[PDB]
Amino acid sequence: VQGFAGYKAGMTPREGMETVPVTVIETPPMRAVALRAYEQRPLTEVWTDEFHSELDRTLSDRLDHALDIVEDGGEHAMNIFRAGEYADVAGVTKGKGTQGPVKRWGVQKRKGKHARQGWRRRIGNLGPWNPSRVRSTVPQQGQTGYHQRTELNKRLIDIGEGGPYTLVKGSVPGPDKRLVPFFRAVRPNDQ
C-alpha cells in the first residue's frame, strides 16, 4: 500500500530525561491489498478476497517488504518504525467549518474607536479600481476542518505491543483521537 498507517489514540507526555510530550497511535497490521507495479501493461490493484467479515458490508522497499507480509496472507504489523526515527504523518483536519476572515486567516480587524461600535470581523478590501474586478487571490472565508493535513520530520520515539501501538514525538497528529492518520518517513533532513 506503499507506506505505514493507523489512527489517533491520544496525547500526553511525561518522563524522559527533561520531559517530552507525545501521542499514541493505533495499529496492529490493516491487511494486504495488491502491490504497486506498472508491469507488462498497467498493473495497479487487485482483491482476491481474504478480507474482514464485515467488508462486504461495503463491497522498491516499503511496499516491497509489503510484498513480504502482504503475501504472508494479508496484514503486516506496524513498527518498522523503531527506536526514534522519522515518519511523517497525515491526518484529516478536524471539521472547523465555515468561518471569518479572522481564523480562516490571520487578519487585524476593526481597529479601536470602532473595533467594537457594533462593528467587527469582515476582511477589509478587495481590489484597486483600474486593475479590474477580482483576483483568485485573497482567500475568502475559506472553510477548514476537512482539509487533508500533515507534516514533516516526524520523530517517533517508542512503541510497544499490548496492542500494536506507537508513541511519537510531538502529537500535532492533526485530527482528534479515534481518527485516521498515516505515516511514512520520507525526505528526512534530520535523517
Partner: protein, 122 residues
C-alpha cells in the same frame, strides 16, 4: 513579555527603583522580555540620584516575571513580580548586590555576577 512601556523594578542597588521597557533586544521582529532576555528601556524613577537618576537611558537583563516560565523540566515557576538588573553592555550588572530571588536562567544565558550575588535562586 514586558515590552513597550511595561514597568518592572530593581533588585540591584544599581540606583533605580523602576524602569519602562522599550525594545525587547535580540534583533527585529521580536516582542518579549522574559527572564534571561535583555531589554532596552529606562528610568521612570530612581532614588535620590544614586548614580543612575530618573529618566535615564538604559539596558538591562530579565530577572523575575509572573508570566510563569516553564522549565525544560515540565515543571513550573512564577513570581509575584516583574524586575531585573541593569548592566554595562558587556552583560554585567551594575547593582553591586542583589535583591529578589532569580532563576537558573541567568547562568544559562550568561549572568554569574548576578547569579552569585542572588539572595536566592530557583
Amino acid at each position: 513579555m514586558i515590552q513597550q512601556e511595561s514597568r518592572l523594578k530593581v533588585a540591584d542597588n544599581s540606583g533605580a527603583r523602576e524602569v519602562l521597557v522599550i525594545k525587547v533586544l535580540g534583533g527585529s521582529g521580536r516582542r518579549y522580555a522574559n527572564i534571561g532576555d535583555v531589554v532596552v528601556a529606562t528610568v521612570k524613577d530612581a532614588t535620590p540620584g544614586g548614580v543612575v537618576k530618573k529618566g535615564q537611558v538604559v539596558k538591562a537583563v530579565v530577572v523575575r516575571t509572573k508570566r510563569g516560565v516553564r522549565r525544560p523540566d515540565g515543571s513550573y515557576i512564577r513570581f509575584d513580580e516583574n524586575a531585573c538588573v541593569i548592566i554595562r553592555d558587556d552583560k554585567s550588572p551594575r547593582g553591586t548586590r542583589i535583591f529578589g530571588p532569580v532563576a537558573r536562567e541567568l547562568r544559562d544565558k550568561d549572568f554569574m555576577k548576578i547569579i552569585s550575588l542572588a539572595p536566592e535562586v530557583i
